[PDB]
Design a protein around this motif. Structure first.
Motif, PDB file in Angstrom:
ATOM      1  N   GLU A  73       0.813  -1.203   0.000  1.00 36.46           N
ATOM      2  CA  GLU A  73       0.000   0.000   0.000  1.00 36.46           C
ATOM      3  C   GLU A  73       0.848   1.255   0.000  1.00 36.46           C
ATOM      4  O   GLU A  73       0.675   2.121  -0.856  1.00 36.46           O
ATOM      5  CB  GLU A  73      -0.933   0.013   1.206  1.00 36.46           C
ATOM      6  N   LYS A  74       1.762   1.360   0.961  1.00 38.08           N
ATOM      7  CA  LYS A  74       2.627   2.531   1.024  1.00 38.08           C
ATOM      8  C   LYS A  74       3.375   2.641  -0.305  1.00 38.08           C
ATOM      9  O   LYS A  74       3.723   3.743  -0.745  1.00 38.08           O
ATOM     10  CB  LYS A  74       3.635   2.424   2.181  1.00 38.08           C
ATOM     11  N   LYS A  75       3.606   1.492  -0.947  1.00 36.08           N
ATOM     12  CA  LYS A  75       4.314   1.448  -2.230  1.00 36.08           C
ATOM     13  C   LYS A  75       3.384   1.834  -3.382  1.00 36.08           C
ATOM     14  O   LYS A  75       3.842   2.217  -4.465  1.00 36.08           O
ATOM     15  CB  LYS A  75       4.902   0.044  -2.471  1.00 36.08           C
ATOM     16  N   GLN A  76       2.079   1.732  -3.142  1.00 32.94           N
ATOM     17  CA  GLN A  76       1.099   2.078  -4.163  1.00 32.94           C
ATOM     18  C   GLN A  76       0.571   3.481  -3.963  1.00 32.94           C
ATOM     19  O   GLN A  76       0.232   4.166  -4.927  1.00 32.94           O
ATOM     20  CB  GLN A  76      -0.079   1.113  -4.156  1.00 32.94           C
ATOM     21  N   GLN A  77       0.478   3.903  -2.709  1.00 35.35           N
ATOM     22  CA  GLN A  77       0.001   5.244  -2.414  1.00 35.35           C
ATOM     23  C   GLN A  77       1.000   6.267  -2.935  1.00 35.35           C
ATOM     24  O   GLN A  77       0.646   7.396  -3.262  1.00 35.35           O
ATOM     25  CB  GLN A  77      -0.198   5.415  -0.913  1.00 35.35           C
ATOM     26  N   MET A  78       2.256   5.853  -3.014  1.00 37.45           N
ATOM     27  CA  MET A  78       3.316   6.706  -3.512  1.00 37.45           C
ATOM     28  C   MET A  78       2.992   7.005  -4.972  1.00 37.45           C
ATOM     29  O   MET A  78       3.029   8.152  -5.408  1.00 37.45           O
ATOM     30  CB  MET A  78       4.654   5.972  -3.391  1.00 37.45           C
ATOM     31  N   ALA A  79       2.647   5.960  -5.715  1.00 37.41           N
ATOM     32  CA  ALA A  79       2.310   6.087  -7.124  1.00 37.41           C
ATOM     33  C   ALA A  79       0.911   6.651  -7.343  1.00 37.41           C
ATOM     34  O   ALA A  79       0.672   7.333  -8.328  1.00 37.41           O
ATOM     35  CB  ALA A  79       2.440   4.732  -7.811  1.00 37.41           C
TER      36      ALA A  79
ATOM     37  N   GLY C   1      15.028  12.648  10.923  1.00 34.84           N
ATOM     38  CA  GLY C   1      14.051  11.598  11.322  1.00 34.84           C
ATOM     39  C   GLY C   1      12.743  12.076  10.796  1.00 34.84           C
ATOM     40  O   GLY C   1      11.718  11.419  10.846  1.00 34.84           O
ATOM     41  N   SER C   2      12.804  13.266  10.258  1.00 31.00           N
ATOM     42  CA  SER C   2      11.611  13.863   9.719  1.00 31.00           C
ATOM     43  C   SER C   2      10.948  12.961   8.691  1.00 31.00           C
ATOM     44  O   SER C   2       9.799  12.572   8.844  1.00 31.00           O
ATOM     45  CB  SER C   2      11.948  15.221   9.077  1.00 31.00           C
ATOM     46  N   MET C   3      11.723  12.589   7.678  1.00 25.41           N
ATOM     47  CA  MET C   3      11.237  11.839   6.522  1.00 25.41           C
ATOM     48  C   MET C   3      11.892  10.497   6.136  1.00 25.41           C
ATOM     49  O   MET C   3      12.929  10.117   6.677  1.00 25.41           O
ATOM     50  CB  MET C   3      11.343  12.775   5.340  1.00 25.41           C
ATOM     51  N   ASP C   4      11.296   9.832   5.140  1.00 25.82           N
ATOM     52  CA  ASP C   4      11.722   8.515   4.622  1.00 25.82           C
ATOM     53  C   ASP C   4      12.662   8.517   3.400  1.00 25.82           C
ATOM     54  O   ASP C   4      12.221   8.566   2.247  1.00 25.82           O
ATOM     55  CB  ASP C   4      10.464   7.697   4.301  1.00 25.82           C
ATOM     56  N   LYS C   5      13.959   8.413   3.675  1.00 26.14           N
ATOM     57  CA  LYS C   5      15.006   8.430   2.656  1.00 26.14           C
ATOM     58  C   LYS C   5      14.871   7.413   1.530  1.00 26.14           C
ATOM     59  O   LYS C   5      15.451   7.579   0.461  1.00 26.14           O
ATOM     60  CB  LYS C   5      16.365   8.243   3.324  1.00 26.14           C
ATOM     61  N   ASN C   6      14.108   6.357   1.770  1.00 23.98           N
ATOM     62  CA  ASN C   6      13.913   5.293   0.783  1.00 23.98           C
ATOM     63  C   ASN C   6      12.767   5.568  -0.216  1.00 23.98           C
ATOM     64  O   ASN C   6      12.911   5.360  -1.422  1.00 23.98           O
ATOM     65  CB  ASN C   6      13.670   3.976   1.531  1.00 23.98           C
ATOM     66  N   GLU C   7      11.627   6.025   0.296  1.00 21.79           N
ATOM     67  CA  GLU C   7      10.473   6.335  -0.540  1.00 21.79           C
ATOM     68  C   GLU C   7      10.894   7.393  -1.552  1.00 21.79           C
ATOM     69  O   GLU C   7      10.368   7.445  -2.661  1.00 21.79           O
ATOM     70  CB  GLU C   7       9.319   6.867   0.323  1.00 21.79           C
ATOM     71  N   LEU C   8      11.845   8.236  -1.159  1.00 28.78           N
ATOM     72  CA  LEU C   8      12.333   9.285  -2.041  1.00 28.78           C
ATOM     73  C   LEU C   8      13.075   8.689  -3.236  1.00 28.78           C
ATOM     74  O   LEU C   8      12.876   9.137  -4.371  1.00 28.78           O
ATOM     75  CB  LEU C   8      13.244  10.259  -1.278  1.00 28.78           C
ATOM     76  N   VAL C   9      13.922   7.686  -2.988  1.00 25.24           N
ATOM     77  CA  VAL C   9      14.659   7.033  -4.073  1.00 25.24           C
ATOM     78  C   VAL C   9      13.656   6.374  -5.024  1.00 25.24           C
ATOM     79  O   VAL C   9      13.877   6.285  -6.232  1.00 25.24           O
ATOM     80  CB  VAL C   9      15.627   5.959  -3.538  1.00 25.24           C
ATOM     81  N   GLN C  10      12.542   5.918  -4.464  1.00 25.56           N
ATOM     82  CA  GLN C  10      11.511   5.293  -5.263  1.00 25.56           C
ATOM     83  C   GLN C  10      10.794   6.337  -6.082  1.00 25.56           C
ATOM     84  O   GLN C  10      10.621   6.161  -7.281  1.00 25.56           O
ATOM     85  CB  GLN C  10      10.512   4.551  -4.372  1.00 25.56           C
ATOM     86  N   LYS C  11      10.376   7.424  -5.440  1.00 25.35           N
ATOM     87  CA  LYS C  11       9.682   8.494  -6.151  1.00 25.35           C
ATOM     88  C   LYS C  11      10.567   8.958  -7.304  1.00 25.35           C
ATOM     89  O   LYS C  11      10.069   9.286  -8.384  1.00 25.35           O
ATOM     90  CB  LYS C  11       9.406   9.685  -5.230  1.00 25.35           C
ATOM     91  N   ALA C  12      11.881   8.973  -7.059  1.00 23.78           N
ATOM     92  CA  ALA C  12      12.874   9.405  -8.047  1.00 23.78           C
ATOM     93  C   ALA C  12      12.889   8.496  -9.269  1.00 23.78           C
ATOM     94  O   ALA C  12      13.097   8.967 -10.397  1.00 23.78           O
ATOM     95  CB  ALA C  12      14.277   9.459  -7.406  1.00 23.78           C
ATOM     96  N   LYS C  13      12.671   7.198  -9.047  1.00 20.91           N
ATOM     97  CA  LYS C  13      12.667   6.237 -10.136  1.00 20.91           C
ATOM     98  C   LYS C  13      11.314   6.184 -10.830  1.00 20.91           C
ATOM     99  O   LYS C  13      11.229   5.832 -12.009  1.00 20.91           O
ATOM    100  CB  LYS C  13      13.073   4.855  -9.628  1.00 20.91           C
ATOM    101  N   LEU C  14      10.260   6.541 -10.100  1.00 17.10           N
ATOM    102  CA  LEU C  14       8.913   6.560 -10.652  1.00 17.10           C
ATOM    103  C   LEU C  14       8.771   7.826 -11.476  1.00 17.10           C
ATOM    104  O   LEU C  14       7.954   7.888 -12.393  1.00 17.10           O
ATOM    105  CB  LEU C  14       7.868   6.558  -9.536  1.00 17.10           C
ATOM    106  N   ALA C  15       9.573   8.835 -11.140  1.00 16.19           N
ATOM    107  CA  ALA C  15       9.558  10.106 -11.857  1.00 16.19           C
ATOM    108  C   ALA C  15      10.289   9.928 -13.180  1.00 16.19           C
ATOM    109  O   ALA C  15       9.905  10.506 -14.198  1.00 16.19           O
ATOM    110  CB  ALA C  15      10.239  11.185 -11.033  1.00 16.19           C
ATOM    111  N   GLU C  16      11.352   9.128 -13.147  1.00 16.66           N
ATOM    112  CA  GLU C  16      12.154   8.828 -14.337  1.00 16.66           C
ATOM    113  C   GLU C  16      11.295   8.116 -15.385  1.00 16.66           C
ATOM    114  O   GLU C  16      11.295   8.493 -16.557  1.00 16.66           O
ATOM    115  CB  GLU C  16      13.355   7.953 -13.952  1.00 16.66           C
ATOM    116  N   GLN C  17      10.566   7.090 -14.953  1.00 16.78           N
ATOM    117  CA  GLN C  17       9.699   6.342 -15.841  1.00 16.78           C
ATOM    118  C   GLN C  17       8.698   7.284 -16.484  1.00 16.78           C
ATOM    119  O   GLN C  17       8.469   7.220 -17.689  1.00 16.78           O
ATOM    120  CB  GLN C  17       8.950   5.273 -15.063  1.00 16.78           C
TER     121      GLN C  17
END
Lengths: 226, 7, 228, 7
Positions: A73-79, C1-17
């Motif tokens: 979900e967290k992986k889908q909510q991102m998208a 500790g504010s945010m998630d360093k990993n989801e960002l790398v993902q958003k970065a790759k989803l942005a590339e696509q």
């Protein structure tokens, strides 16, 4: 009297060269709002700038809307949220063009080929707005397209030789509207062939030459894979 | 998807 | 500790696509600022996102800066537009350059990272030098030379002349000398050197470095050719 | 112009 309608058309062409369509579309929005009727050049610059701008969003939309389901979900909510950010970005473009069309362009165009050109666009952008459209208001936007397209088809279907590109394109985009949007694979090929066979009859006429054939190809490519 | 006008 | 360093790398790759590099660069700027050292994947996502972003502006810059030279009201239209892009371009360079000197470079173990990030530093200072005008010019032209040299010497003492990164460093460096530092002499000097030195172990390039290594040498050579 | 790194 607050500004120079000409320098804008220039800025619009200087933006095209630098391949900055967002800038290019803005310069043309300003030109359309001047009131004057769009010359064939200005009319293209507009159609070009906006199809290029909404183009990027529709494309990015599909891409992100796809990986959304696959990672469904967290992986889908991102998208999910990202496709909604683009979606509204896309919905904005459509509304500016659609307004520019119904308020300035369409009501102010003598040439029947303009009345069918601008009207084709109206059918087009309402369709893109229908693609990303979700919910109830959906059926409503899907209708605004059908009508705008029909209002144009009938005009060309009584004003332009079936070999004329603009009418061919109208038939092309229209047919696609029926296939993808209005889930009607029947009517889909109905006009596809018709406008194609009718175009073949005077094919030995056609300057228009290239574009005419290019479209018929797409018209046919559609029929094939449909 | 299906094809449509371009340039 | 504010945010998630990993989801960002993902958003970065989803942005590339979705081919939205401005978005992609932003997601990677946030990741770099997390402090951690960039993994090879994240490091590319960064280099990719920013070179794509500054890329569009450098290209648009030349295009507009050209039609500018070739009425006054007709030229001022083009002049101001090239200054709008120029600053847009200058902004990208400053974020990356900062991201490099403050986080990336000082925080990279792998010598190939220290030469990779440092190549970038030399690169972006150079793009900043291209559009650079006036007096402050000579100053930015220097920041590049040094950043490139500081990297050349590191690779010139840490990586086989067949390694892509070092080949690229030589490639971009040589170009710095030719175009930027108007020195067509030194230009080919390192171009050939890094090229001939790469040919020597060319029969190595295990099936891995192989491609990129050759691709660059080609460019390295293509450069040499059209320079004579 | 001269060539440089890319991907």
């Amino acid at each position: 009297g607050s500004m120079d309608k000409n320098e804008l058309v220039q800025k619009a062409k200087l933006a095209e060269q630098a391949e900055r369509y967002d800038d290019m579309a803005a310069c043309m929005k300003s030109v359309t709002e001047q009131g004057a009727e769009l010359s064939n050049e200005e009319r293209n610059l507009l159609s070009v700038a906006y199809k290029n701008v909404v183009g990027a969003r529709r494309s990015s939309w599909r891409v992100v809307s796809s990986i959304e389901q696959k990672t469904e979900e967290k992986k889908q909510q991102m998208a999910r949220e990202y496709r909604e950010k683009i979606e509204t970005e896309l919905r904005d473009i459509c509304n500016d063009v659609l307004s520019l069309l119904e308020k300035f362009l369409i009501p102010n165009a003598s040439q029947a080929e303009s009345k069918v050109f601008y009207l084709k666009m109206k059918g087009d952008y309402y369709r893109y707005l229908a693609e990303v459209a979700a919910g109830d208001d959906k059926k409503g936007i899907v209708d605004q397209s059908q009508q705008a397209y029909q209002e144009a088809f009938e005009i060309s279907k009584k004003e332009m030789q079936p070999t004329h590109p603009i009418r061919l394109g109208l038939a092309l985009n229209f047919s696609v509207f029926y296939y993808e949007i209005l889930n009607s694979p029947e009517k889909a090929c109905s006009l596809a062939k018709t406008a194609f066979d009718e175009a073949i009859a005077e094919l030995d006429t056609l300057e228009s030459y290239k574009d005419s054939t290019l479209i018929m190809q797409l018209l046919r490519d559609n029929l094939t894979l449909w | 998807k299906s094809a449509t006008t371009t340039v």
